[PDB]
Amino acid sequence: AAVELAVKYINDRHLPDKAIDVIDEAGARARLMPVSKRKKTVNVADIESVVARIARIPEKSVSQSDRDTLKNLGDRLKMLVFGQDKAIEALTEAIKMARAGLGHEHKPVGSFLFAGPTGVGKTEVTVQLSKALGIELLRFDMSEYMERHTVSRLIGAPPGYVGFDQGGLLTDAVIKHPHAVLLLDEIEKAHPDVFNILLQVMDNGTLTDNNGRKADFRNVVLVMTTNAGVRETERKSIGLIHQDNSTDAMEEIKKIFTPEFRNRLDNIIWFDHLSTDVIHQVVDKFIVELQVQLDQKGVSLEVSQEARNWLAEKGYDRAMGARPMARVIQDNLKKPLANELLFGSLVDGGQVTVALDKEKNELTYGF
Amino acid sequence: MENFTTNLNQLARVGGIDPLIGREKELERAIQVLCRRRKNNPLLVGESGVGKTAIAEGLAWRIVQGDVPEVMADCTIYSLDIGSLLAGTKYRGDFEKRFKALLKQLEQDTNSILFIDEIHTIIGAGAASGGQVDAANLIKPLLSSGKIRVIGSTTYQEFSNIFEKDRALARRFQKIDITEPSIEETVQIINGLKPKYEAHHDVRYTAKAVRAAVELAVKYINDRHLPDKAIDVIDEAGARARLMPVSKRKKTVNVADIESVVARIARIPEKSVSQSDRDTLKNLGDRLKMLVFGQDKAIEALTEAIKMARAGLGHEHKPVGSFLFAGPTGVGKTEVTVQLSKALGIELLRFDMSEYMERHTVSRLIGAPPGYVGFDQGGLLTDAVIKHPHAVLLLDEIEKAHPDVFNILLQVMDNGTLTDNNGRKADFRNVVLVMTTNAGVRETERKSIGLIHQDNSTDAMEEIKKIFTPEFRNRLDNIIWFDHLSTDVIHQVVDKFIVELQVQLDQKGVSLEVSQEARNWLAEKGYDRAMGARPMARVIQDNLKKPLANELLFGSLVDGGQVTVALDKEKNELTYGF
Amino acid sequence: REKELERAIQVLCRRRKNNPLLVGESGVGKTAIAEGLAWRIVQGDVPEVMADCTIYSLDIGSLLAGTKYRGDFEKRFKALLKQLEQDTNSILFIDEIHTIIGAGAASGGQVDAANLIKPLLSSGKIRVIGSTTYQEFSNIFEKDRALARRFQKIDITEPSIEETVQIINGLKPKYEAHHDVRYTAKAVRAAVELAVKYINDRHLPDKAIDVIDEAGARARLMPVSKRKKTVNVADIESVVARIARIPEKSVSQSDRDTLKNLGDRLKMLVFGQDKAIEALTEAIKMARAGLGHEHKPVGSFLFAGPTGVGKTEVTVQLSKALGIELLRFDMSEYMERHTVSRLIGAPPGYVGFDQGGLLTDAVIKHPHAVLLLDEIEKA
Numbered sequence A: 001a002a003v004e005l006a007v008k009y010i011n012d013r014h015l016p017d018k019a020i021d022v023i024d025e026a027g028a029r030a031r032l033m034p035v036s037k038r039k040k041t042v043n044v045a046d047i048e049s050v051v052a053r054i055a056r057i058p059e060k061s062v063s064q065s066d067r068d069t070l071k072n073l074g075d076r077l078k079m080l081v082f083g084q085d086k087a088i089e090a091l092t093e094a095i096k097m098a099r100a101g102l103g104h105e106h107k108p109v110g111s112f113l114f115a116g117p118t119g120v121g122k123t124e125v126t127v128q129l130s131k132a133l134g135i136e137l138l139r140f141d142m143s144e145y146m147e148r149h150t151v152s153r154l155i156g157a158p159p160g161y162v163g164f165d166q167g168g169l170l171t172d173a174v175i176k177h178p179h180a181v182l183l184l185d186e187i188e189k190a191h192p193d194v195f196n197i198l199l200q201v202m203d204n205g206t207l208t209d210n211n212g213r214k215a216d217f218r219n220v221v222l223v224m225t226t227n228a229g230v231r232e233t234e235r236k237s238i239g240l241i242h243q244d245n246s247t248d249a250m251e252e253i254k255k256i257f258t259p260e261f262r263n264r265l266d267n268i269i270w271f272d273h274l275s276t277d278v279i280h281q282v283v284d285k286f287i288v289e290l291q292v293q294l295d296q297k298g299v300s301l302e303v304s305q306e307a308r309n310w311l312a313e314k315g316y317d318r319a320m321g322a323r324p325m326a327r328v329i330q331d332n333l334k335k336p337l338a339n340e341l342l343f344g345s346l347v348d349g350g351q352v353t354v355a356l357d358k359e360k361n362e363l364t365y366g367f
Numbered sequence B: 001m002e003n004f005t006t007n008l009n010q011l012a013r014v015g016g017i018d019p020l021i022g023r024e025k026e027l028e029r030a031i032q033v034l035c036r037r038r039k040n041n042p043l044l045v046g047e048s049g050v051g052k053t054a055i056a057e058g059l060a061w062r063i064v065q066g067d068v069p070e071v072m073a074d075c076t077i078y079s080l081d082i083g084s085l086l087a088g089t090k091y092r093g094d095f096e097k098r099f100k101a102l103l104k105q106l107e108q109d110t111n112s113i114l115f116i117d118e119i120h121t122i123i124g125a126g127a128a129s130g131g132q133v134d135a136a137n138l139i140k141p142l143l144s145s146g147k148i149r150v151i152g153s154t155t156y157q158e159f160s161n162i163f164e165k166d167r168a169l170a171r172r173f174q175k176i177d178i179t180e181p182s183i184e185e186t187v188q189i190i191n192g193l194k195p196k197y198e199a200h201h202d203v204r205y206t207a208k209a210v211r212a213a214v215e216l217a218v219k220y221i222n223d224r225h226l227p228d229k230a231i232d233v234i235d236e237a238g239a240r241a242r243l244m245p246v247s248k249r250k251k252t253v254n255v256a257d258i259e260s261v262v263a264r265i266a267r268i269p270e271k272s273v274s275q276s277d278r279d280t281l282k283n284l285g286d287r288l289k290m291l292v293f294g295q296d297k298a299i300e301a302l303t304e305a306i307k308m309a310r311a312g313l314g315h316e317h318k319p320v321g322s323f324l325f326a327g328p329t330g331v332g333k334t335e336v337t338v339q340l341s342k343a344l345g346i347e348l349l350r351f352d353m354s355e356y357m358e359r360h361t362v363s364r365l366i367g368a369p370p371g372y373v374g375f376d377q378g379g380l381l382t383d384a385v386i387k388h389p390h391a392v393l394l395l396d397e398i399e400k401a402h403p404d405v406f407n408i409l410l411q412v413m414d415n416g417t418l419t420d421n422n423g424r425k426a427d428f429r430n431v432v433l434v435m436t437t438n439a440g441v442r443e444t445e446r447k448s449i450g451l452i453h454q455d456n457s458t459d460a461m462e463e464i465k466k467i468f469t470p471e472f473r474n475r476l477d478n479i480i481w482f483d484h485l486s487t488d489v490i491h492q493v494v495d496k497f498i499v500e501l502q503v504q505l506d507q508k509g510v511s512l513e514v515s516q517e518a519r520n521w522l523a524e525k526g527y528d529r530a531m532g533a534r535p536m537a538r539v540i541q542d543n544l545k546k547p548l549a550n551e552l553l554f555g556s557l558v559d560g561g562q563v564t565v566a567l568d569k570e571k572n573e574l575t576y577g578f
Numbered sequence C: 001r002e003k004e005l006e007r008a009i010q011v012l013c014r015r016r017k018n019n020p021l022l023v024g025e026s027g028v029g030k031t032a033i034a035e036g037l038a039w040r041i042v043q044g045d046v047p048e049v050m051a052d053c054t055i056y057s058l059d060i061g062s063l064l065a066g067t068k069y070r071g072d073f074e075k076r077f078k079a080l081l082k083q084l085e086q087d088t089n090s091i092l093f094i095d096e097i098h099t100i101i102g103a104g105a106a107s108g109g110q111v112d113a114a115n116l117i118k119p120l121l122s123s124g125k126i127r128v129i130g131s132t133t134y135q136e137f138s139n140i141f142e143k144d145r146a147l148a149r150r151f152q153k154i155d156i157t158e159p160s161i162e163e164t165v166q167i168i169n170g171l172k173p174k175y176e177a178h179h180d181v182r183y184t185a186k187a188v189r190a191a192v193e194l195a196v197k198y199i200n201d202r203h204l205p206d207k208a209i210d211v212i213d214e215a216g217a218r219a220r221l222m223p224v225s226k227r228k229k230t231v232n233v234a235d236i237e238s239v240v241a242r243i244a245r246i247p248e249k250s251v252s253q254s255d256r257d258t259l260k261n262l263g264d265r266l267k268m269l270v271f272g273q274d275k276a277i278e279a280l281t282e283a284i285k286m287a288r289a290g291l292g293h294e295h296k297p298v299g300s301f302l303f304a305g306p307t308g309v310g311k312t313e314v315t316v317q318l319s320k321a322l323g324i325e326l327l328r329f330d331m332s333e334y335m336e337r338h339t340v341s342r343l344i345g346a347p348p349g350y351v352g353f354d355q356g357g358l359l360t361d362a363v364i365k366h367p368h369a370v371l372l373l374d375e376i377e378k379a
């Protein structure tokens, strides 16, 4: 098992030295293992532990709290991204499979194309996944790679040119944090010549930069969020029946990405629009965030449930997702609270209350 | 080991080494690697200021403290000073002699450890133009035999570019990744380090002070790593507080002090509102409404965005405000933004987006990739924002740039960061992003056909929606549609222009007065709603400046006096004087 | 510079990494900040802890002189750091600190001024003040992150107008002693304001000093019959207009006539089309008298009509009569949506980057000129 693991997990050293290093370090560890005088034989499990320590990969941790982290990962994420349950499920199941050992042989943990309308929890669920898993988030705003020659920034400049000693951004970011979440935001904006890198990154899990180093993607959860066809999803068709433009957006996805690219994607999760109950939950999340902001200043806040319904009905817009709700919460609360907080009664003291009046459709405030 | 190394255990016995907090996993791994049979040389790599040298020295510290398993006891650690060792080796063979003497001492000791900080530095000692026996090669055989134990420390970039380029030496060292602590871990580190800084600065840090320092260093300082910038804020606040007792403003380190220090370091405003800065925002809308007439909702939006930002309850990682001022020509879109920059005394970053008509012009904004001619220059946008993190960013006529360039502002408006070709992240959290245009105006200046004239009020919004992508419009703070200038607005505008002309005259020692009927006649002559307030300045020009310029350039008004303008009724002309 | 010096002293009192790095634009006065901190130390106008410490300005050439025979530089530098360590009352000032990122042998680019001070700065036994510009700081300095994290960056912004006036008033004694001339305070204010207005490619606290020094040097050259006189608004205005190409005061000289008979002189060469000449002459006269637009060209005119009636002729005759270089751009060469790349230059990374723009370089080289765009409807 030591020889096999050093073969298929340690790819920067050669064979009759990395097996020897695994053996030597396992022996030294079992020699230091007698913190309770416990010296035994080196079994397969100890070798796997030493290897996972060397290659910087997650080991067999079902006996750890990681078991409980992965257990309630779906429910914990569902309390930060409301609706869009199928995407959270796909992400959590991919991460679980990768942890249980039933992963892919030489592929990244997952390579998902998060598509859907705007303002829905597309790029947000990835950040929350990186937070919940506690692993570093490698975010790459792919809208800066519109030029076909920006690949030199991703993988570095070739030998003989100015940017050689800088290296590639993506390869170096992966090499630093092999266990991470790769967020390639707004993937459709990059020049099509950039997808050809993700081709081999997804099919073979590796990437070679200019210095000849091998970037190992076998623990990276590759997530790309797009808006391909969003202009179509918001368009009202001609006719007596308004159509569902989701399959149109999927055909646009097919027209953007080459078949050999879409063929190795683990899933193309089409996010759906937010419903009214989802909007109510979004309003509640935003109010909680605002309350945290206020408590950072020593100011309390409570909002009558009817006022939250009023805010939801005022801001609800399915064609624009959950972003207009932040603007509505802003316009209705943050401005009055700011005027009270800067030069007003709210300096160095809070206990602000909010409620809706039914005759005038307004809000109440005060110390 | 006489004058080339420093006995770390001796320095720890005199208390010269800061106490190591946590780092149990990394220390255990270092011990496991050290107790290997051969190639037992741990290599600590990680980002700058994550605690690599800290861990290496805390190893000797713990050895002196006895908090070590009973295998590393009595193993005194020596730190190597490459400069001191290379100082006097002027003649050939001397460096090799002293290095071999040091290696013999270490090998015969069989117990000491050599900690070579910045270990990427030993790949050159030779001078005879080649791949000489230099220290890199002089230690290669010993590591492969495990007779001596060496600890290294080098950053990720240094290790990746210089150290691991020598495969033979690299494979002899065991890499140990020192990741930056978490918020709780760095809180515990600062708690453990508190006695030293408290004795140094003679101040006391509250627990809330330490927590706020860590949180604010995580939020604002984004170019350094955790256990080095949090203690940076702490030590800076201590040094600042110790400079108060000379003015007898001595106290403990409260959260407000930490916030002031962080606002200073990040060059952002945090709590200056406690001073005479609340009044600055209080009359900000008023101070603008006397410089830009009409278009009041724009001033409301700008003032409220800045108020939410300064009060504290703004956006978390988004620009202070991202607005799209759309409206006809000459209604104050550029002017309100310029006067906003002037009122706050904050730097204005002006970008005429008509020079970005081509898709490939984005290299001007974010720089050229590695390997290309303009690499050493960097982007204009990112460098401007890095120099001025608290500023107003104005994108004139953004509809004139190639529609692909807005995808750059996508991440600027959503996440507030922008990465140029060197990996630097321009911070947009304190930038008032304003983009001006006349996109949907042409559709509103349309003459309908038929018996019934139809309302074209929604055509401007339709055109704006058809120009800017939905995922772009979805992250705008507000789209302030500007209205045309009315008659009374034209009166106020001609008054503003007359005041500017009067200042231009006062520069030359001249005075001017314009009758009220003369002002109304000026307002009547050049008023044109389709052209805004520029033709009014044009009419003021061709009516007053030309005759006044003739009087000034020739005779009469050289050091002139009170010039009086009055309107006739028989012909409706203007009168003048001296 | 109370706040900058205050933050520098706060940094210099830190327990670790007490190394202020003064970074700002070129000509802002970071070197001046350091030398003035020294000068305040010699005068006792410093905080108590910052007394009794002497600032050493380190020069790389003097240290790097003759250091062949590998080891000589390392020995020199270790001896320097040793002598500096025993003080605890000495501060090292490196003027161009972005230049200490290499002194090692070319064989292996290695131990140098950088890798020899890292353990010293991180351990807080010595204190160093640095200075660099943004262009060098973001390209050379913050590439050794382990070295950048040891220095506390201090932004040195350029002063305001009145702050610059006070700086000029504080520096006036030495320039007056050097040139043996006197500057009136009104002339100083005018110098600062005109430097703000016209000198656009240099920063505030330096271009005003430049105007002052040049006015003094020239006023020392006027006394061909010993006509030593104090520098007033007029002479300083002329010195500024030397770069601005148009004096605002000097119009009362033998140039009021040129604007007086400009229209008749042009009508002597362009017959008919009188109102065009009227408009051009009136615009030039307004801009000369000082009623011009503070942020717009002297004029922006559209000449229309049938061909060959003197549209280009009036312009070329204007450029000749005013002694002004005619900048002609034929809009027949610009019939494509991608030719503006020759007007403003190509983006970085492209074949025509270092070539620069045509229109921009023309206007930069000829600040005072006439811009002619033939057949604007063709472009």
Ligand SMILES: Nc1ncnc2c1ncn2[C@@H]1O[C@H](COP(=O)(O)OP(=O)(O)OP(=O)(O)O)[C@@H](O)[C@H]1O
Pocket: A080, A081, A082, A083, A084, A117, A118, A119, A120, A121, A122, A123, A124, A125, A225, A226, A227, A274, A281, A282, A285, A322, A323, B471, B472, B474
């Ligand atoms: N399903 C959701 N539940 C709760 N909050 C949400 C949801 N979606 C979005 N939000 C909130 O609205 C904001 C936008 O979310 P997000 O960035 O994930 O959408 P997006 O798909 O990336 O937008 P775009 O397509 O324009 O890139 C976030 O601040 C997020 O907190």
Ligand SMILES: Nc1ncnc2c1ncn2[C@@H]1O[C@H](COP(=O)(O)OP(=O)(O)OP(=O)(O)O)[C@@H](O)[C@H]1O
Pocket: B018, B019, B020, B021, B022, B023, B047, B048, B049, B050, B051, B052, B053, B054, B055, B153, B154, B155, B189, B190, B192, B193, B227, B228, B231, C016, C122, C145, C146, C149
């Ligand atoms: N594990 C730790 N516990 C407590 N404090 C710490 C720890 N690590 C670091 N520090 C503090 O953070 C400071 C800088 O971190 P550290 O010295 O360990 O990294 P470094 O060796 O300087 O890395 P580099 O040389 O590449 O910049 C130290 O002065 C130390 O006081």
Ligand SMILES: Nc1ncnc2c1ncn2[C@@H]1O[C@H](COP(=O)(O)OP(=O)(O)OP(=O)(O)O)[C@@H](O)[C@H]1O
Pocket: B291, B292, B293, B294, B295, B327, B328, B329, B330, B331, B332, B333, B334, B335, B336, B436, B437, B438, B492, B493, B496, B533, B534
């Ligand atoms: N609402 C206003 N009140 C007073 N003066 C004004 C107003 N608008 C404009 N002006 C004046 O007219 C000039 C042009 O103003 P400005 O450039 O800001 O308009 P604009 O909206 O940007 O036009 P455009 O559509 O071409 O961008 C300025 O000198 C300004 O002083």
Ligand SMILES: Nc1ncnc2c1ncn2[C@@H]1O[C@H](COP(=O)(O)OP(=O)(O)OP(=O)(O)O)[C@@H](O)[C@H]1O
Pocket: C001, C024, C025, C026, C027, C028, C029, C030, C031, C032, C033, C131, C132, C133, C167, C170, C171, C205, C206, C209
């Ligand atoms: N705060 C100040 N007080 C008095 N005089 C000053 C100040 N700043 C600058 N000066 C003067 O203006 C000139 C420019 O300042 P200074 O020389 O110190 O900057 P610098 O060293 O050229 O910066 P850089 O190296 O980045 O180009 C100096 O001659 C200096 O005497």
Ligand SMILES: Nc1ncnc2c1ncn2[C@@H]1O[C@H](COP(=O)(O)OP(=O)(O)OP(=O)(O)O)[C@@H](O)[C@H]1O
Pocket: C269, C270, C271, C272, C273, C306, C307, C308, C309, C310, C311, C312, C313, C314
């Ligand atoms: N009003 C005039 N006064 C003097 N000379 C004139 C006049 N009109 C024409 N000409 C003569 O015609 C010649 C060419 O005139 P010009 O170059 O200005 O053409 P234009 O008016 O610019 O029209 P276009 O360039 O579109 O054909 C001049 O050399 C000039 O001698």
